[PDB]
Amino acid sequence: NVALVFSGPAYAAEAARLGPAVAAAVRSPGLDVRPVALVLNGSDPRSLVLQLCDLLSGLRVHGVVFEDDSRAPAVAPILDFLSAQTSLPIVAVHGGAALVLTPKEKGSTFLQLGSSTEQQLQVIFEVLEEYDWTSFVAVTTRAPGHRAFLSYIEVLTDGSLVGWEHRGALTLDPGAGEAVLSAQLRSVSAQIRLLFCAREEAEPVFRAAEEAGLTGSGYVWFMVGPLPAGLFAVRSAGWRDDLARRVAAGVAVVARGAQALLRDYGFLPELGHDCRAQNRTHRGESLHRYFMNITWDNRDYSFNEDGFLVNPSLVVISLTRDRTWEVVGSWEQQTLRLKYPLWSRYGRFLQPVDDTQHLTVATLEERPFVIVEPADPISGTCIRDSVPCRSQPEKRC
Amino acid sequence: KIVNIGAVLSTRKHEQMFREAVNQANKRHGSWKIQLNATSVTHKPNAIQMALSVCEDLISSQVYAILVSHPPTPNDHFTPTPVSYTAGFYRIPVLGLTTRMSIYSDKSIHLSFLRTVPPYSHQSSVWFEMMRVYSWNHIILLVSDDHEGRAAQKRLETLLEERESKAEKVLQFDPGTKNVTALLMEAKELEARVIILSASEDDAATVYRAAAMLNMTGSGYVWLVGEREISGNALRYAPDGILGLQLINGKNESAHISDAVGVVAQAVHELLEKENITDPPRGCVGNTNIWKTGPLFKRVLMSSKYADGVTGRVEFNEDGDRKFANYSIMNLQNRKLVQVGIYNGTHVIPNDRKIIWPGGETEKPRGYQMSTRLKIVTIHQEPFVYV
Amino acid sequence: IDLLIKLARTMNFTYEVHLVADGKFGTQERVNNSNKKEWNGMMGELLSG
């Protein structure tokens, strides 16, 4: 049996109707799925451990799909310990238990459908080079994982024919003061800033951003983890798939993951069927050996040894004048397909600081004086020691 | 009205003097309304049920901080784990004792934890100075491949860069090793003889037996070994010249309990000001929001200068660690661990008795062996190297 | 090789010659994982041991 656990009163209404809906949607040979509806509410860790353990003894369930409404990620470690304790593979599709957590406890089976910061950082650079946004600043403050945040920055621009440049501050303190923060933000040498900071501290630094006046239409921001115009972030289909596809996706991994051991031999692991009845829990093997060759809905869902997704479907989200989050581009397994045709510069998704100092020039092609060659197809950007020239269109050096 | 701090201990018998420690709150700082109460309970024998013995036990009694102690059974960090996850769920600061593990030193998993006992990873700081006053240049070290093993290796390499660049050869092995002498064969090919072991309490026994058959315990060899590879089965089947370390005030629960409550009681006094002093959430029936001043309270405990207890050196770095902990370098002399020095941050040698080295040699052997056999790489360049 | 014999006789050591495996002189490049650069050729066999 597969357990379906829902947290939050919002999902209480839809929990009842979701049971039979997925029973006939996906079927596997030699397996039966009996979804259940849970109405537990409250952030306290009382029902998450009493009912769940009783559920294991009650219905003898293996494989749990978890989803939450609020953006509180404090509940993820609660089941991570439980996953490593009773050897129960628990997978959460979206909600609070979706952010990547490292390191994980040894001998665990907790899985997440999310994207790490290292995976998220690489897709930002292709957005910069698409619109020729070489100038950028990397600014961050005290963060749990800022050590690898900067470590992966210098390695992206080390290679490639295109010439990049680096600039960045050290840290920002919310309690330092608006005047102090404004003074420290004056040491910049570019127009684009990449932000990686905690959610709680993100709002004060944005409120103090308008104090220094660095929130105009001439600047853009990227969020890695009041709101200035032109904000970008990556959510990895966070607002997509609605709800029916997510619960269907969660049970698909468990059903096909469980069949990995079933084809070799007929064995029913009921290790997770009890919590306190047996005083021994040494019996455990092949906890994470499986769940490495997963294919569904013409997509790849391979999972690494650590227990997080390594082949995601990233999507970029922009900001509109109506203060809404909308998908502008796309990304389909390393294709970098961007919609909204990228023609000209400083006119789309970014504007010059001074209009009067932005002027157009015209040129011709004379072999010893002006040389025109096509753009580099390897990277899709014009080579170094050259400037773009849109033939009024295409892009040429 | 009343200041109450929670704590879980090894046994109820260990709570008898804990009440005595906290009943003296009248003769402490402030002495206006603070009435320190033990509010202690013996830990569940099973660590899984500890999650069921905190919400209805600790948070229900209006606790500000929790103390977790090592169980009498030789468990593997079973006790401090559930407490940290529960305390970290409400962002209430927690501090433990006798928790010698390096997995509590990162805030990614344990956001709040202030232990007063340094982990095994700080032994490498001793090894740097211990071998410097003996004129030893480069080493070869055997390190277990796990989270604990690599913690010491990363520290030693970082410090050694400023003095003698890197080591000679770092050899790693699986923590479930059993009759693995392949890595030891190339160990006696690098003229080091300064072998430094960092295995577990039980894995080091295999190394000693494996190396004994290769006459690695004779003269000219020295062994720098941590505390974990001395006690238990490691003492038997061991070289007669181990220079292992130890801790002076370690495994002293009574002293730590008295010292732990001193800083906590003093920390409460300093927080009494005009700012937000909202009490931690009460009960575990309904509790979703997190108190604002919790992060502030944790910072106070980090910068507390308690000049009493263990020679009055109660200071904390950006993480929860002890400073200038005395180690009392130990030397094995015919099944008789004899101290040959003390450590207080700077090496001091109260050289009681004399030092015996493996093979029975009195004077300290060097860690070098010149090799007259060389291997040379050449390439095919016509005027220079024909082939 | 003629220069090698003179050094060994003067400094009293014994040698053992062997060619290179790859067939290169030496340069620094990045492995397929992360950017932890490594050497190759004659510069990568002296450092390894």
Side-chain angles (χ1 to χ4, degrees), chain A residues 1-141 143-166 168-177 179-234 236-263 266 269-272 274-298 300-338 340-397, chain B residues 2-11 13-162 165-387, chain C residues 1-29 31-35 37-49:
Chain A
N1 198 331
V2 175
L4 268 301
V5 181
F6 314 99
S7 179
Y11 298 106
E14 301 87 34
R17 54 98 181 178
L18 282 172
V22 303
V26 179
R27 190 63 62 180
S28 303
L31 285 181
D32 56 329
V33 49
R34 301 93 70 182
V36 294
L38 274 65
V39 78
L40 54 90
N41 55 325
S43 182
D44 280 322
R46 304 290 291 115
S47 56
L48 266 296
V49 296
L50 294 177
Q51 161 67 22
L52 215 158
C53 160
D54 177 63
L55 172 65
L56 296 178
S57 60
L59 284 74
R60 310 291 175 175
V61 295
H62 59 274
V64 180
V65 175
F66 204 98
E67 49 183 356
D68 194 312
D69 190 9
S70 177
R71 313 183 195 270
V75 296
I78 291 187
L79 286 184
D80 205 334
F81 152 77
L82 256 178
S83 180
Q85 185 267 346
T86 182
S87 64
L88 180 67
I90 299 180
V91 184
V93 283
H94 98 284
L99 298 86
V100 184
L101 180 65
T102 54
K104 284 187 55 190
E105 182 58 34
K106 198 248 184 178
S108 57
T109 48
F110 178 57
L111 266 303
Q112 294 171 307
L113 292 180
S115 59
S116 55
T117 167
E118 266 66 31
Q119 300 160 334
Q120 198 165 346
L121 255 56
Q122 69 173 0
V123 77
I124 288 185
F125 276 68
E126 284 98 39
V127 181
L128 271 63
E129 77 171 19
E130 224 71 36
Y131 311 95
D132 217 333
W133 284 357
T134 300
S135 60
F136 73 97
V137 178
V139 286
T140 180
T141 182
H146 56 48
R147 294 86 182 176
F149 179 76
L150 277 175
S151 299
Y152 190 72
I153 286 297
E154 313 102 0
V155 310
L156 296 172
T157 62
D158 171 64
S160 299
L161 296 173
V162 189
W164 309 77
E165 63 275 0
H166 185 275
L170 55 155
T171 177
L172 305 89
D173 180 67
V180 180
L181 293 178
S182 176
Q184 306 294 340
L185 221 58
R186 306 281 76 88
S187 61
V188 293
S189 300
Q191 200 168 125
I192 302 182
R193 294 151 174 82
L194 277 67
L195 177 66
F196 166 64
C197 171
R199 307 285 81 83
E200 177 152 306
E201 193 190 347
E203 207 72 13
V205 74
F206 276 150
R207 295 314 189 97
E210 297 110 3
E211 180 66 34
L214 267 170
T215 49
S217 58
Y219 294 87
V220 294
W221 293 77
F222 271 84
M223 202 176 61
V224 167
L227 282 308
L231 193 63
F232 291 81
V234 181
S236 307
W239 308 94
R240 311 283 73 83
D241 302 320
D242 191 74
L243 171 135
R245 247 183 57 91
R246 293 172 177 168
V247 55
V251 302
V253 180
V254 181
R256 292 168 296 120
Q259 285 194 166
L261 55 89
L262 193 62
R263 49 100 177 179
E270 290 102 6
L271 296 84
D274 283 321
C275 358
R276 317 300 203 274
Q278 58 282 350
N279 220 331
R280 64 115 190 89
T281 336
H282 61 77
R283 203 177 79 179
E285 66 267 8
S286 62
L287 290 84
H288 218 302
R289 290 176 59 260
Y290 322 112
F291 319 101
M292 45 75 61
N293 187 279
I294 309 299
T295 56
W296 195 254
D297 200 76
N298 57 90
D300 183 73
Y301 299 85
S302 303
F303 300 107
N304 209 23
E305 179 65 27
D306 195 301
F308 76 110
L309 183 57
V310 292
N311 186 265
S313 55
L314 308 181
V315 289
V316 293
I317 306 94
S318 181
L319 176 61
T320 335
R321 189 64 269 178
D322 58 357
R323 296 180 55 88
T324 55
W325 267 7
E326 55 157 324
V327 183
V328 280
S330 297
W331 188 81
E332 181 187 340
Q333 290 296 329
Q334 198 67 44
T335 42
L336 313 166
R337 169 208 164 185
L338 278 298
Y340 278 75
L342 44 146
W343 299 126
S344 182
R345 191 191 172 182
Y346 281 87
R348 198 57 152 177
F349 284 63
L350 213 167
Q351 299 299 140
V353 287
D354 303 328
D355 167 69
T356 58
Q357 290 189 1
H358 186 67
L359 54 152
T360 61
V361 309
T363 328
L364 205 73
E365 175 183 352
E366 210 69 17
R367 174 56 54 177
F369 293 97
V370 183
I371 312 175
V372 171
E373 50 263 30
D376 188 9
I378 308 301
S379 300
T381 54
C382 174
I383 210 186
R384 195 171 58 256
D385 299 73
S386 299
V387 294
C389 269
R390 37 150 173 169
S391 177
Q392 288 215 11
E394 293 82 8
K395 165 180 295 183
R396 315 173 194 190
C397 298
Chain B
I2 48 181
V3 172
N4 289 17
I5 54 180
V8 59
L9 304 180
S10 60
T11 322
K13 183 70 62 174
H14 296 86
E15 310 175 8
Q16 310 305 96
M17 70 286 295
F18 180 49
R19 304 183 303 271
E20 167 65 22
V22 303
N23 283 328
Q24 313 165 11
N26 49 11
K27 50 184 64 58
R28 260 156 180 75
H29 266 272
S31 66
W32 311 300
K33 66 102 182 178
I34 55 167
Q35 303 295 135
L36 210 55
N37 296 268
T39 67
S40 60
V41 58
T42 305
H43 50 47
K44 186 77 186 183
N46 310 337
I48 309 100
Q49 290 79 323
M50 207 69 58
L52 311 178
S53 181
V54 283
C55 250
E56 61 105 356
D57 290 334
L58 295 176
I59 300 97
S60 302
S61 177
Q62 192 73 66
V63 293
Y64 323 119
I66 308 95
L67 316 182
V68 47
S69 186
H70 190 278
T73 56
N75 295 118
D76 176 61
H77 52 62
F78 278 166
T79 28
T81 301
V83 178
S84 182
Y85 283 16
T86 298
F89 195 76
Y90 295 159
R91 307 302 182 276
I92 43 182
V94 66
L95 56 153
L97 66 154
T98 67
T99 65
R100 299 246 285 178
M101 294 300 177
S102 300
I103 57 180
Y104 300 85
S105 176
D106 46 352
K107 282 79 179 180
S108 57
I109 48 181
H110 299 277
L111 197 63
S112 302
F113 198 90
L114 265 68
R115 66 196 180 282
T116 183
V117 183
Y120 296 111
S121 187
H122 281 89
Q123 289 181 159
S124 177
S125 301
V126 167
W127 287 341
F128 197 107
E129 196 172 355
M130 177 184 183
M131 75 178 180
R132 187 182 61 88
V133 300
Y134 278 50
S135 69
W136 285 334
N137 302 269
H138 35 264
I139 58 181
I140 52 182
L141 59 161
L142 313 181
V143 172
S144 300
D145 194 3
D146 47 72
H147 198 289
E148 203 71 19
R150 308 171 313 183
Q153 178 189 340
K154 189 159 58 66
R155 174 197 293 258
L156 187 53
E157 300 189 51
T158 304
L159 304 181
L160 200 56
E161 163 263 323
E162 69 198 1
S165 67
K166 53 169 292 184
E168 174 142 23
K169 203 64 181 181
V170 183
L171 304 184
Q172 300 165 290
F173 64 103
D174 45 358
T177 174
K178 187 65 167 53
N179 297 15
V180 180
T181 74
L183 71 104
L184 276 179
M185 273 303 183
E186 79 248 18
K188 58 162 184 176
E189 295 262 26
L190 314 167
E191 57 261 7
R193 293 85 173 85
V194 203
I195 298 96
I196 295 189
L197 191 58
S198 182
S200 79
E201 188 271 350
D202 201 6
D203 297 330
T206 303
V207 178
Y208 297 154
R209 283 171 50 256
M213 318 308 174
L214 305 181
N215 54 87
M216 305 274 293
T217 179
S219 178
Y221 286 96
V222 299
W223 294 79
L224 301 185
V225 172
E227 186 176 358
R228 281 176 62 182
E229 313 87 351
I230 289 186
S231 297
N233 228 330
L235 201 153
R236 273 66 44 83
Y237 296 81
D240 204 74
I242 295 187
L243 264 295
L245 269 293
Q246 258 187 3
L247 202 64
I248 289 198
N249 228 27
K251 274 290 301 184
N252 203 336
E253 77 296 337
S254 180
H256 274 134
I257 291 179
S258 62
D259 198 9
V261 73
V263 51
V264 179
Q266 188 243 0
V268 177
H269 173 257
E270 313 171 63
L271 194 59
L272 304 172
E273 272 297 328
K274 328 154 187 175
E275 215 66 25
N276 54 331
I277 195 181
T278 165
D279 296 325
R282 159 73 170 275
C284 188
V285 179
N287 270 329
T288 301
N289 193 19
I290 311 179
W291 62 333
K292 297 286 187 177
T293 182
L296 174 61
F297 180 57
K298 176 187 176 184
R299 176 174 292 170
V300 181
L301 296 147
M302 284 175 48
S303 181
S304 181
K305 304 178 184 55
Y306 184 69
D308 201 334
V310 193
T311 68
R313 57 180 195 266
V314 191
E315 269 192 335
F316 289 81
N317 65 282
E318 68 93 4
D319 201 323
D321 296 312
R322 191 72 183 192
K323 304 306 173 297
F324 305 96
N326 300 328
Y327 285 97
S328 65
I329 305 186
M330 304 287 288
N331 198 322
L332 180 140
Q333 308 189 8
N334 196 339
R335 313 307 102 85
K336 191 66 189 65
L337 276 301
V338 176
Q339 184 176 5
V340 292
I342 70 176
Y343 191 85
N344 63 95
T346 303
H347 187 213
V348 179
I349 174 181
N351 49 272
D352 296 1
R353 296 85 191 178
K354 66 204 316 296
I355 297 173
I356 181 180
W357 302 95
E361 178 60 31
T362 62
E363 217 286 321
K364 46 165 298 302
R366 322 170 319 280
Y368 224 84
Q369 174 76 357
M370 194 66 58
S371 59
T372 59
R373 172 76 63 173
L374 280 71
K375 299 184 293 304
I376 302 181
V377 279
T378 55
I379 207 179
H380 190 322
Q381 288 285 294
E382 187 73 10
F384 293 98
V385 175
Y386 302 86
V387 173
Chain C
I1 300 301
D2 205 331
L3 169 62
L4 168 59
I5 304 181
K6 183 60 167 55
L7 297 181
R9 178 155 46 90
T10 303
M11 299 165 55
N12 288 330
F13 60 79
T14 309
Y15 51 89
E16 206 169 15
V17 185
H18 64 77
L19 291 169
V20 203
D22 303 10
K24 301 298 184 306
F25 276 109
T27 187
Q28 200 170 20
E29 287 186 354
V31 283
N32 305 331
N33 50 323
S34 65
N35 213 42
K37 290 191 180 188
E38 89 297 340
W39 288 95
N40 53 14
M42 300 197 297
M43 276 284 299
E45 296 188 7
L46 175 64
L47 301 175
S48 57

